[PDB]
Amino acid sequence: PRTVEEVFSDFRGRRAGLIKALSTDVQKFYHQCDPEKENLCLYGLPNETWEVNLPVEEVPPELPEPALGINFARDGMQEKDWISLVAVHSDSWLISVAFYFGARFGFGKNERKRLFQMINDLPTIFEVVTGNA
Amino acid sequence: SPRTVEEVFSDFRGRRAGLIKALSTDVQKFYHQCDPEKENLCLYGLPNETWEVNLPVEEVPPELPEPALGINFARDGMQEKDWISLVAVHSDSWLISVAFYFGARFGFGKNERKRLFQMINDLPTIFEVVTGNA
Numbered sequence: 001p002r003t004v005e006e007v008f009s010d011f012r013g014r015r016a017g018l019i020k021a022l023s024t025d026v027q028k029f030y031h032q033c034d035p036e037k038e039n040l041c042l043y044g045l046p047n048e049t050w051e052v053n054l055p056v057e058e059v060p061p062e063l064p065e066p067a068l069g070i071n072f073a074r075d076g077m078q079e080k081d082w083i084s085l086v087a088v089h090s091d092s093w094l095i096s097v098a099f100y101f102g103a104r105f106g107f108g109k110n111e112r113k114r115l116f117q118m119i120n121d122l123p124t125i126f127e128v129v130t131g132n133a
Numbered sequence: 134s135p136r137t138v139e140e141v142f143s144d145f146r147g148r149r150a151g152l153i154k155a156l157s158t159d160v161q162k163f164y165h166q167c168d169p170e171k172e173n174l175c176l177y178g179l180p181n182e183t184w185e186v187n188l189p190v191e192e193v194p195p196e197l198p199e200p201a202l203g204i205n206f207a208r209d210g211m212q213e214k215d216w217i218s219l220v221a222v223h224s225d226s227w228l229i230s231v232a233f234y235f236g237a238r239f240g241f242g243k244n245e246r247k248r249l250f251q252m253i254n255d256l257p258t259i260f261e262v263v264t265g266n267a
Contacts, residue, residue: 038191039191059173059202059203059206059207060173060201060202060203060204060206060207060219060223061201061202061203064198064199064201064223064226064227064230065198065199065202067195067198067199068191068195068199069191069192069193069194069195070194070195072193072194073194088234088237088238089195089198089234091233091237092198092230092231092233092234092237093198093230095229095230095233096198096226096227096229096230097226099225099226099229100222100223100225100226103222103225103226103258103260104222109254109257112254113254116247116250116254120243120246120247120250124237126237
């Protein structure tokens, strides 16, 4: 069903916004992550934008939430290692969101397999930011 | 695959079994712990096949992905089996997040991620289990 492509399009859009935050806009992202601020995250939207403040959602929130408090360790390691750690959390979030949508759209086992194959043909954000893409 | 792939899958299967317990065998205990008079609660699965309903807190640093919060707010607004299904789908998305997070911390590459997904997707989702979709 063309619904696998719609869910994958959403995933690619959020992934593009997160890759922007962690590469092209890395210093903007870094400076918004002062380590004494509370509850910051990296949130990706399918229009290829990003934000560090958790958006207000319904209750329960419809989408899985990304990691909060990612800014505490910003100064405790090399910037590229902190970026890599944000990348790993971000990759685990994106796959959560995509499979949540797949379930909401009534994907069965075959649709779940097709969605994963498309996701896993792209380098992870971790691989992008570490130079292993 | 390296041994770590099966070890990450074993963690996944054990948490899944705990979540299946909460949403089936232990459903009334789970239901009553999802008290609508408490603050927003989450359902967690642990690798020893147990489950817990806890208020999420601001863990610093963040560790595992966080499950859906506020499941207790929706409990009385739906037929119980539809609320169970809602919790199940959120729990399925949490489990795959946890598994791929561990896989990343343990340096999985493309092939290791494929093998891990293959094993996860052999099993019916918790949503399928609780709705009779196998």
